[PDB]
Amino acid sequence: SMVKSGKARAHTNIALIKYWGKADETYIIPMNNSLSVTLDRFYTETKVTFDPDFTEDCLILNGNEVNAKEKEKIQNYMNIVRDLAGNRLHARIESENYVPTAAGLASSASAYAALAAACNEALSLNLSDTDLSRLARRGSGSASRSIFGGFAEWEKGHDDLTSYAHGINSNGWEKDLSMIFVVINNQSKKVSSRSGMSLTRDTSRFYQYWLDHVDEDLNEAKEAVKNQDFQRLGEVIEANGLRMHATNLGAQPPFTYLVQESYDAMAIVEQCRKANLPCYFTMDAGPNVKVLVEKKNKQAVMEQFLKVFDESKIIASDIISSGVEIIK
Amino acid sequence: MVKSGKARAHTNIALIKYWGKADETYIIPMNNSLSVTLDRFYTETKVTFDPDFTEDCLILNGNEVNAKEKEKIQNYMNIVRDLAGNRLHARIESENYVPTAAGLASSASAYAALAAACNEALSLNLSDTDLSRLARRGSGSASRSIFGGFAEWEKGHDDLTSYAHGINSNGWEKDLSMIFVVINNSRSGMSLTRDTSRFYQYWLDHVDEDLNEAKEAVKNQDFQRLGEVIEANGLRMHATNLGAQPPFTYLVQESYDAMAIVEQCRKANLPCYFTMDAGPNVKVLVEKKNKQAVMEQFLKVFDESKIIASDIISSGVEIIK
Ligand SMILES: O=C(O)[C@@H]1CCCN1C(=O)COP(=O)(O)OP(=O)(O)O
Numbered sequence: 001s002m003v004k005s006g007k008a009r010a011h012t013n014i015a016l017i018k019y020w021g022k023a024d025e026t027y028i029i030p031m032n033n034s035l036s037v038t039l040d041r042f043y044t045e046t047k048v049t050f051d052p053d054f055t056e057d058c059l060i061l062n063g064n065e066v067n068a069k070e071k072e073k074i075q076n077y078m079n080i081v082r083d084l085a086g087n088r089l090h091a092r093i094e095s096e097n098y099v100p101t102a103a104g105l106a107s108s109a110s111a112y113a114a115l116a117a118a119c120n121e122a123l124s125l126n127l128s129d130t131d132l133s134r135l136a137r138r139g140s141g142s143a144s145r146s147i148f149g150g151f152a153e154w155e156k157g158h159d160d161l162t163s164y165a166h167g168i169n170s171n172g173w174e175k176d177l178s179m180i181f182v183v184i185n186n187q188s189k190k191v192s193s194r195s196g197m198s199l200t201r202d203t204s205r206f207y208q209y210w211l212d213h214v215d216e217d218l219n220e221a222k223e224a225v226k227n228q229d230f231q232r233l234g235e236v237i238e239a240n241g242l243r244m245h246a247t248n249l250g251a252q253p254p255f256t257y258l259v260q261e262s263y264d265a266m267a268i269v270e271q272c273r274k275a276n277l278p279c280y281f282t283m284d285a286g287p288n289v290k291v292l293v294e295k296k297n298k299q300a301v302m303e304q305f306l307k308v309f310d311e312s313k314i315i316a317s318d319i320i321s322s323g324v325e326i327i328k
Numbered sequence: 329m330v331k332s333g334k335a336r337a338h339t340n341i342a343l344i345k346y347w348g349k350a351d352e353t354y355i356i357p358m359n360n361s362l363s364v365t366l367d368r369f370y371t372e373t374k375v376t377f378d379p380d381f382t383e384d385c386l387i388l389n390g391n392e393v394n395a396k397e398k399e400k401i402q403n404y405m406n407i408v409r410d411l412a413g414n415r416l417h418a419r420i421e422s423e424n425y426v427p428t429a430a431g432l433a434s435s436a437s438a439y440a441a442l443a444a445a446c447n448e449a450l451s452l453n454l455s456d457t458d459l460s461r462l463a464r465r466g467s468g469s470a471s472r473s474i475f476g477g478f479a480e481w482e483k484g485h486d487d488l489t490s491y492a493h494g495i496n497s498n499g500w501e502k503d504l505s506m507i508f509v510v511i512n513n514s515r516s517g518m519s520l521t522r523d524t525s526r527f528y529q530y531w532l533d534h535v536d537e538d539l540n541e542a543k544e545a546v547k548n549q550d551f552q553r554l555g556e557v558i559e560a561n562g563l564r565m566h567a568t569n570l571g572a573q574p575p576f577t578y579l580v581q582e583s584y585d586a587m588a589i590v591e592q593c594r595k596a597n598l599p600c601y602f603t604m605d606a607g608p609n610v611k612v613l614v615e616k617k618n619k620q621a622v623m624e625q626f627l628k629v630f631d632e633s634k635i636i637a638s639d640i641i642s643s644g645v646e647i648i649k
């Protein structure tokens with residue numbers, strides 16, 4: 001009778017125009033806008049239960065305790081929630097990732113968007129989509145975008161109030177598109193995108209080059225979406241993604257997320273283009289290659305990869321039209 | 329009635345990179361380049377023109393050359409026949425003094441030595457300029473190996489104007505060394521990149537400024553200043569390949585491991601700077617006074633057999649005998 005709960009499902013998203021580097025490390029304010037598509041196949045379901053008897057926040061992930069470290073980090077995030085709601089209630093958070101994390105797919109975007117929405121629901125905060133995006137953003141930058149379906153854009157702003165995402169209307173175009181995930185063999189050594197982007201943003205000799213072109217890329221991609229022009233969107237996003245990886249090469253000292261196998265998959269995309277199967281690739285904080293393709297060519301493109309790659313390593317998802325949702 | 333000559337040329341490493349051709353037929357580059365010539369790695373080549381020879385023969389390290397190289401040699405020798413004004417075919421006996429199967433060895437020392445050997449054999453008395461032009465026709469990088477120490481290849485605009493020259497640094501080269509880090513996993517890569525790379529314009533926009541900064545650092549013997557610009561330039565070159573259609577890279581994780589050690593050395597008062605060519609090997613420029621200290625840092629991580637140092641040689645291509 002004194003316990004408040006809410007549960008939400010939020011889907012992962014992949015940046016076509018990259019978020020890479022922060023203006024503000026504390027509040028997670030980015031150096032540039034980003035543009036993403038939200039994936040139907042992969043998502044996180046998160047329940048939060050607030051109870052006055054709880055003395056601290058507890059996080060249960062895929063049925064298992066998290067270590068004292070994750071627990072510490074989740075408690076700090078929930079302080080933001082408590083401050084926002086004006087209460088001192090602690091919560092038990094029970095989360096399930098339905099994201100291929102072992103295969104290298106990121107879950108922080110769906111995780112924080114799900115948590116943000118679940119809290120809004122549990123506490124009856126009535127946050128707008130803008131304020132939900134802002135709350136999610138404090139947990140993970142890319143989470144700001146997972147509040148939304150289809151195409152979404154993160155507006156960088158200049159502070160906590162002005163940095164947030166919104167959904168882009170594409171006249172239903174997202175329903176015609178898909179993404180193929182090529183799972184690429186990589187080392188299982190620890191990697192962090194927050195840490196990588198910070199080293200690059202602070203020291204990279206090629207970071208200015210990234211900054212000088214990103215707005216142009218973004219405008220070009222947005223214009224391509226307004227026109228449902230697949231080739232035009234693809235060319236700029238593929239180039240934007242490669243420029244992002246270029247910046248890491250200029251870091252002090254340099255680094256890369258790509259491995260030879262990543263390059264083999266890229267070669268396959270170009271082969272597909274020359275054989276009249278339009279598609280374009282992007283890569284994130286890892287070697288996995290993501291292939292944007294029109295839904296009607298999804299299978300034809302997949303068969304080309306399935307010549308080279310194990311069946312288990314080629315995973316396609318549609319792009320979902322709806323945004324974060326409240327569930328049982 | 330037999331004409332023979334022998335020459336030794338040393339490999340050189342581009343500090344400001346040659347990457348991309350304006351003209352594929354005459355090997356004219358999109359930009360100037362700046363290299364240092366190495367003491368340790370070289371090619372000795374003997375050429376013999378026998379009227380009784382009907383076809384060009386290349387024996388390399390006691391063995392015969394593959395089909396692609398053989399064809400390349402016969403095409404190149406035609407240029408030499410044309411220049412000389414004879415029709416003599418030649419037996420070429422060439423020896424590479426480099427560590428075996430380590431990704432070293434260079435078209436640069438090979439064609440520079442071949443050019444000088446022919447020059448000697450046929451008594452052409454070519455000026456250094458025209459000798460660099462002849463070497464250029466075999467391999468662009470060979471234009472620079474005619475010289476020792478620092479050398480610059482001036483791109484010019486045709487066969488006559490595109491050649492290298494040696495740079496006088498008042499003996500500065502005697503104070504410098506280069507450490508090779510051998511790591512396991514160009515005309516074709518640079519071709520794809522020059523023709524298709526989405527980032528090639530970025531390369532062209534900055535190369536001339538890098539070159540000037542590099543040449544000015546050399547006049548002042550300013551190691552840190554030279555090092556910083558050449559490291560950035562090297563990395564921009566590999567960036568261009570990332571934007572190629574489709575993208576490719578010469579670097580592997582261990583290449584990045586070596587670069588990280590260079591960075592730690594700098595932070596430990598041991599100035600040194602890296603560069604990479606058309607492969608994963610990392611080359612580290614360092615002053616002689618710090619060579620051993622920097623090598624010790626590498627030997628903490630890499631095997632001794634993989635860490636190979638060379639001085640920068642002051643003299644240029646050289647006739648043997
Ligand atoms: O997907 C993204 O938006 C960008 C573009 C390329 C990959 N990437 C990332 O890895 C972003 O990783 P995040 O977990 O959102 O970083 P934080 O804000 O520090 O929490």
Ligand SMILES: O=C(O)[C@@H]1CCCN1C(=O)COP(=O)(O)OP(=O)(O)O
Pocket residue numbers: 341342345346347355361435436466467468469470514515604605606
């Ligand atoms: O060393 C060089 O000067 C450049 C800079 C980076 C690497 N590199 C090369 O691989 C040049 O290789 P080359 O055999 O001279 O090229 P070609 O004129 O087509 O024969």
